[PDB]
Amino acid sequence: ASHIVGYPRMGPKRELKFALESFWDGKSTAEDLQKVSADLRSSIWKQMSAAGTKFIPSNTFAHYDQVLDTTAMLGAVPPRYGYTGGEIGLDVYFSMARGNASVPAMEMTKWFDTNYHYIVPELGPEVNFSYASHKAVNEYKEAKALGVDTVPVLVGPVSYLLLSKAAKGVDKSFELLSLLPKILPIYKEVITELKAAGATWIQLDEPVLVMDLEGQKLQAFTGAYAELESTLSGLNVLVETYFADIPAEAYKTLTSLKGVTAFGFDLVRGTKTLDLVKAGFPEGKYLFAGVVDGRNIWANDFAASLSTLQALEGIVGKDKLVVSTSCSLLHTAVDLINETKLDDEIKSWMAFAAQKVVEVNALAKALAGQKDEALFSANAAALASRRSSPRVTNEGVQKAAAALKGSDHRRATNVSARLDAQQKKLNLPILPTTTIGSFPQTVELREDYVKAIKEEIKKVVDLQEELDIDVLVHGEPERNDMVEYFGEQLSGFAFTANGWVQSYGSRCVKPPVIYGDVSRPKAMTVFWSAMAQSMTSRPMKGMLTGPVTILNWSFVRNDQPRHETCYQIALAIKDEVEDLEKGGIGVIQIDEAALREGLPLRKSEHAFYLDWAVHSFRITNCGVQDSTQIHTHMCYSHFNDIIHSIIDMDADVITIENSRSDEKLLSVFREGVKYGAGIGPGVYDIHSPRIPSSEEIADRVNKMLAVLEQNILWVNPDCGLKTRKYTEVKPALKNMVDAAKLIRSQ
Ligand SMILES: Nc1nc2c(c(=O)[nH]1)NC(CNc1ccc(C(=O)N[C@@H](CCC(=O)O)C(=O)O)cc1)CN2
Ligand SMILES: N[C@@H](CCS)C(=O)O
Ligand SMILES: [Zn+2]
Ligand SMILES: [Zn+2]
């Protein structure tokens, strides 16, 4: 049998994207949107079954988020929204989702370790839970009436609570898992209506079981399914887990939960679970083998899969083994059959969702003796291509056996005995002003030199006149996507035409694709950066994108360990740094916006990640002078749990985030750490259109002088000004300089 754990909910050409925004625009109504949603929903079920898909999921579709879909299912709507009861419709739903013009929208956080963000529920002891949304049962019927039987996918009761958060007031000591009693009754009613409509299988998504859970929490799972058993009578229950391997303890709790008859394992990222199963599995319980990476974009190693699936068939195979995606296809793109610009051979090497739906089957039939030989013949051939094609392997893939020359710390020169030189070369005043990288746009017409400069010099003619700014920037005009920019200008980067993935709400991201060994044969920055530092007699911050960000925000190849690719990228950058140097750019800022992003969900693994991660950064500027100043830029307000790694990046002046945090948190530097190096946390919120005050800045900018060590303190924004209007930033920045001035004055 075959099974897909989840599917994208936007469309092949992002139909729901515009249908969604549209309704919110006010240029379309429910009826029309509903028309679209249901239509897309139909096309998916139809598309899925017609491929042979045995277990087709329903309820994966969402108007915004799945955890919200379940927040409405439990009527767990926040007070400030004014819900009185009854069936929750587009009003209350989209409120919570994106707020209205009188109340704010709920907080969204990252989905486990994915590039997806969900809407964290706000729970507490005073919320009145109720069956407020028949989306599940409704969709089940819709699919049945269309001729296709589906498996309702529900977010596990306990994962739901663990993923939630206690809303304001709820005293610190309140345990969220203390609500299992108020929510479980509702799960029952829902599970009852599904049995009632015909459902013969259900799916509780309990991904949190792949997390490091304490025995008391693991035990929380046990009490839920115990209490659920009766309602689960006569009904196959598939409990899904994904993104990592299951801890041996979690494996015990899982494989012994009540009513659960099937178990979903992510065997792409959690093959380590293979052992646990190899060493013991329930009897007549199913094992959905998640061997088809629904998380990347590459074809599957059909052969490999069969080996894995076969031995699995070994353990059981008595018809209890089901082929499945490693996780929800929500995390991969839709149709690779919308990838035109991409040459043949390369695409021959990729497979998006729709394509993956099919693989699951070629592998399901091949395990049932229906092995469509024409598929493996082609696959294996495409595998052959990739592993050979000189578009992959290289001699750059040799400059690596030299990076084994011990670490790559920036040439002894303790940053402290290095600042002494950087300053000399450019005498800057205490609390040096500056920006982050990007700048607001104008007309913006989608030669180019005569025009490009016109804008760059205005960006500079401004930086100068405008609030001095001890160090200006070129405002990244020539760069749309800070990661794409460099990809197009690189070796192992291909770009897809319609390969989109969702990020949150109606928003998405088309990540560059890293197919082979990265390499920068020609100068990328230099030109524009050099052109900029000549239009002034002030330090100019050269601009680069750290190799960790690039890696993360891009579909990296599943053939060699991340870092290995990360490093290749790190080396490529090492150039543009020593060229903006030769070129004559003094100060240079390298940014790592997505550094914490690639953090493994398994705690004993954070160490290894942060390792190659921060090292690859060094590898970028380890061949730089002692007078060449370096700035790193990360988009985080928290480093408390990763302050050491910041200390190992060896940045002369690191610029991070802040704006809406404490002035005291900054002592995570001045405590048992002793950073001792230019630090610059943001003093102006750029996601808040609204202008700040000269008075507001210079006081918090004083609450840094007294929490840090004003003597290595910088004055910069919060992040690039790319998404702020010139009118919102002009008065704004101006007030960020006056602050330093005064404060200095004394
Ligand atoms: N490589 C690259 N990848 C990225 C980012 C980047 O900086 N560069 N920044 C990221 C953080 N998340 C988001 C989520 C949504 C949007 C967004 O608003 N997207 C528009 C399209 C934006 C566009 O024109 O690109 C949409 O509606 O689909 C932008 C960043 C994620 N991935
Ligand atoms: N400075 C760059 C990278 C930060 S995300 C920018 O402003 O886009
Ligand atoms: Zn930032
Ligand atoms: Zn260290």
CB–CB of 366/372 below 8 Å? yes
CB–CB of 295/268 below 8 Å? yes
| Ligand 1 binding pocket includes 509 (Cβ within 6 Å) | yes
Best CA proximity match to 681, nearest among 649, 727, 646:
646
**Token pair recorded at residue 497:** 């035409």
If you count them, how many residues does the chain have? 746
Residues 704 and 726 in one domain: yes
Residues 433 and 475 in one domain: yes
Provide the residue range defining the domain that includes 710. 389-496+512-746
Q: What is the DSSP string of 537-605?
A: SS-B-EEEE-HHHHHHSSEE-TTS-HHHHHHHHHHHHHHHHHHHHHTT---EEEE-TTSSTT--SSGGG
Please state the domain count of the chain: 2
* Residue that finishes a domain, picked among 511, 542, 567: 511
Order across the sheet with 2-3: list the strands.
Answer: 2-3, 321-325, 286-292, 260-266, 236-240, 201-205, 150-155, 56-58
> Which bound ligand lies closest to the C-alpha atom of 607?
4
> Which bound ligand lies closest to the C-alpha atom of 723?
2
| Ligand 1 binding pocket includes 471 (Cβ within 6 Å) | no
Tell me the one-letter amino acid at 611.
D
Residues 642 and 734 in one domain: yes
3-state DSSP of 227-292: HHHHHHCCCEEEEECCCCCCCHHHHHHHCCCCCEEEEEEECCCCCCHHHHHHCCCCCCCEEEEEEE
| Ligand 2 binding pocket includes 440 (Cβ within 6 Å) | no
The ligand 2 atom nearest the CA atom of 437: 1
Q: How far is 235 from 226, CA to CA, in rounded Å?
A: 15
Q: Is 437 assigned a ligand-binding role in the annotation? A: yes
Tell me the one-letter amino acid at 19.
A
- Pocket test residue of 485, 719, 724 for ligand 2, highest count of atoms within 8 A of CB: 719
CB–CB of 569/550 below 8 Å? yes
Phi-psi region of 16 (alpha: psi -120 to 50; beta: other; left: phi over 0): alpha
Q: How far is 397 from 516, CA to CA, in rounded Å?
A: 10
The ligand 1 atom nearest the CA atom of 506: 27
3-state DSSP of 102-169: CCCCCCEEECCCCCCEEECCEECCCCCCCCCCCHHHHHHHHHHHCCCCEEEEEECHHHHHHHCEECCC
**Token pair recorded at residue 493:** 């980067």
Residues 366 and 398 in one domain: no
Distance 524 CA to ligand 2 centre (A): 17
Best CA proximity match to 320, nearest among 1, 25, 718, 656:
1
CB–CB of 656/682 below 8 Å? yes
Residues 574 and 642 in one domain: yes
**Token pair recorded at residue 149:** 């039987």
H/E stretch holding 513 reads strand 513-514
| Ligand 1 binding pocket includes 162 (Cβ within 6 Å) | no
Please report the beta strands in 623-669, taking only residues with DSSP state E, as ranges in sequence order: 630-633, 653-656
Residues 616 and 636 in one domain: yes
H/E stretch holding 205 reads strand 201-205
Q: How far is 633 from 617, CA to CA, in rounded Å?
A: 11
Reported for 181-187, long-range contacts at CB under 8 A and 24+ positions apart, including other chains, are: 182/127, 182/129, 183/74, 183/76, 183/129, 183/157, 184/157, 184/224, 184/227, 184/228, 185/129, 186/73, 186/74, 186/75, 186/129, 186/130, 186/131, 187/154, 187/157, 187/228
Residues 367 and 404 in one domain: no
CB–CB of 514/557 below 8 Å? yes
Q: Is 111 assigned a ligand-binding role in the annotation? A: no
Active site residue 409: no
Distance 509 CA to ligand 1 centre (A): 5
Q: How far is 456 from 521, CA to CA, in rounded Å?
A: 26
Residues 348 and 478 in one domain: no
| Ligand 2 binding pocket includes 40 (Cβ within 6 Å) | no
CB–CB of 327/270 below 8 Å? no
Three-state DSSP class for 528? helix
The ligand 1 atom nearest the CA atom of 512: 1
User: The domain that contains 696 carries what CATH number?
Assistant: 3.20.20.210
| Ligand 1 binding pocket includes 511 (Cβ within 6 Å) | yes
Q: Is 657 assigned a ligand-binding role in the annotation? A: yes
Residues 252 and 155 in one domain: yes
CB–CB of 637/658 below 8 Å? yes
> Which bound ligand lies closest to the C-alpha atom of 643?
4
Q: How far is 365 from 358, CA to CA, in rounded Å?
A: 11
Q: Kindly provide the resolution of this structure in angstroms, with one decimal.
A: 2.7
Q: Half-sphere exposure of residue 652, counting CA atoms within 13 Å on the CB side?
A: 25
Q: Is 91 assigned a ligand-binding role in the annotation? A: no
Residue 558 buriedness (CB in 10 A; 0-12 / 13-18 / 19+): middle
**What is the bridge-based pairing of β-strands 493-494 and 321-325?**
unpaired
**535: DSSP letter:** S
Distance 431 CA to ligand 4 centre (A): 28
Q: How far is 486 from 572, CA to CA, in rounded Å?
A: 10
Q: Is 508 assigned a ligand-binding role in the annotation? A: yes
CB–CB of 587/636 below 8 Å? no
Closest residue by Cα to atom 1, ligand 1, is 483
Q: How far is 112 from 330, CA to CA, in rounded Å?
A: 13
Q: How far is 707 from 667, CA to CA, in rounded Å?
A: 6
* Residue that finishes a domain, picked among 481, 511, 541: 511
**Token pair recorded at residue 71:** 């927040």
Q: How far is 58 from 578, CA to CA, in rounded Å?
A: 54
**Token pair recorded at residue 438:** 């990007």
Distance 543 CA to ligand 2 centre (A): 9
Closest residue by Cα to atom 23, ligand 1, is 509
**Token pair recorded at residue 147:** 């001729």
Q: How far is 594 from 703, CA to CA, in rounded Å?
A: 28
* Residue that finishes a domain, picked among 457, 488, 511: 511
Number of Cβ within a 10 Å radius of residue 644: 12
Number of Cβ within a 10 Å radius of residue 536: 15
CA distances 409 to 366, 623, 676, Å, are 51, 9, 16
Distance 632 CA to ligand 4 centre (A): 17
The ligand 1 atom nearest the CA atom of 487: 1
> Which bound ligand lies closest to the C-alpha atom of 613?
4
Using only C-alpha atoms, what is the Rg of the chain?
Answer: 27
Q: Is 345 assigned a ligand-binding role in the annotation? A: no
Residues 529 and 580 in one domain: yes
CB–CB of 267/274 below 8 Å? yes
| Ligand 2 binding pocket includes 720 (Cβ within 6 Å) | yes
CB–CB of 431/744 below 8 Å? yes
| Ligand 2 binding pocket includes 593 (Cβ within 6 Å) | yes
Residues 439 and 309 in one domain: no
Q: How far is 17 from 433, CA to CA, in rounded Å?
A: 40
Distance 233 CA to ligand 2 centre (A): 54
Strand partners, 239: 204, 263
Q: How far is 98 from 120, CA to CA, in rounded Å?
A: 13
| Ligand 1 binding pocket includes 21 (Cβ within 6 Å) | no
**472: DSSP letter:** B
**202: DSSP letter:** E
Number of Cβ within a 10 Å radius of residue 43: 13
Q: Is 365 assigned a ligand-binding role in the annotation? A: no
Number of Cβ within a 10 Å radius of residue 413: 15
Three-state DSSP class for 2? strand
- Pocket test residue of 434, 436, 656 for ligand 2, highest count of atoms within 8 A of CB: 436
Catalytic residue among 3, 134, 409, 687: 687
| Ligand 2 binding pocket includes 595 (Cβ within 6 Å) | no
Order across the sheet with 653-656: list the strands.
Answer: 542-545, 588-591, 630-633, 653-656, 678-681
CA distances 179 to 77, 636, 686, Å, are 15, 32, 38
Q: Is 573 assigned a ligand-binding role in the annotation? A: no
Distance 708 CA to ligand 3 centre (A): 21
The ligand 2 atom nearest the CA atom of 543: 1
Residues 213 and 354 in one domain: yes
Q: How far is 186 from 604, CA to CA, in rounded Å?
A: 37
Give per-residue burial for 228-238: e unless 16+ CB within 10 Å, then b: beebbeeebbb
CB–CB of 514/492 below 8 Å? yes
**Token pair recorded at residue 166:** 């206690």
**Token pair recorded at residue 485:** 């920019």
CB–CB of 632/592 below 8 Å? yes
Strand partners, 204: 154, 239
Distance 507 CA to ligand 1 centre (A): 7
Q: How far is 110 from 599, CA to CA, in rounded Å?
A: 12
What is the end-to-end Cα distance of the chain in Å, rounded?
76
> Which bound ligand lies closest to the C-alpha atom of 553?
1
The ligand 2 atom nearest the CA atom of 593: 5
Best CA proximity match to 613, nearest among 639, 588, 595, 591:
595
Q: How far is 362 from 323, CA to CA, in rounded Å?
A: 10
